From a paper:
The disks large homolog 4 MAGUK, commonly known as SAP-90 or PSD-95, is very abundant in the PSD and, in rats, has also been found at axonal juxtaparanodes adjacent to nodes of Ranvier. Knock-down studies have shown that the PSD-95 protein plays an important role in the integrity of synapses by anchoring receptors. The PDZ domains of PSD-95 are all class I PDZ domains, in which the ligand is the C-terminus of the partner protein.
A sequence of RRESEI corresponding to the last six residues (422–427) of Kir2.1 was chosen. The ESEI sequence comprises a type I PDZ domain interaction motif, and the preceding RR residues were included to ensure that a peptide amino terminus does not interfere with ligand association at the PDZ cleft. All of the ligand residues could be fitted, but the two Arg residues had markedly weaker electron density, indicating that alternate conformations of these residues could be present. The main-chain amide linkages of the Ser 425 residue of the incoming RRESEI peptide make H-bonds with the βB-strand of both PDZ domains. In the work described here, the presence of a Glu residue at X−1 appears to be important in allowing an alternate peptide ligand conformation.
Residue numbers in the entry:
A (entry chain A): 58 to 246
B (entry chain Q), C (entry chain P): 422 to 427
Write the structure that this text describes.
Amino acid sequence: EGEMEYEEITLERGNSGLGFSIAGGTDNPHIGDDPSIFITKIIPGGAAAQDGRLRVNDSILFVNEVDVREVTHSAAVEALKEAGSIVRLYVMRRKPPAEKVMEIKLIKGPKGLGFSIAGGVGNQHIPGDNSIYVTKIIEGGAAHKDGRLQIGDKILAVNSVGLEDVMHEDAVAALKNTYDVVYLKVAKP
Amino acid sequence: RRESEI
Amino acid sequence: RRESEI
Ligand SMILES: N[C@@H](CCC(=O)N[C@@H](CS)C(=O)NCC(=O)O)C(=O)O
């Protein structure tokens, strides 16, 4: 958390390009005098989003054999444009703050558990992220009364069934294929 | 994107 | 900020 990590990410160019936006350069330095090329946006449904490894605020250090640590904005764009159909990126990022994993036991009310979910493979709630997210908690429902679950929580598992890289419909099935008492594994920021 | 009730 | 689509 807060420390630098370095990663090789190879992307295959799709019809709409690599599927991300950049800012920075020696002539457009955002944040102090740091000339780094940064990712500012991951395009929904694009190559970077489907791959899932590239993150907003990652700094691109190399594009294939080209050093983009101290280049103009235009030089970076050109290097990415000319990089071919298989693009090998070497990036740097500050590790995000760690998430708290929590177990929550809920008893269903007459209207279920009282929350809504979004996300899944092909329905990413955040571009690049296949996780199931809580998007709504029903006033007066079981999740609300318990008080632990919150909007923006990630559902990792329901009872013994993992929800890592699953389709949205399977996440719903798993959450509805339950008895009255449900055990949830949850990731909080 | 989808949103479902649980 | 200058931003380019890649
Ligand atoms: N671990 C290998 C590779 C790491 C890597 O790919 N990143 C940097 C080296 S610090 C690079 O020059 N990448 C350009 C490339 O893909 O050849 C090494 O010792 O260089």
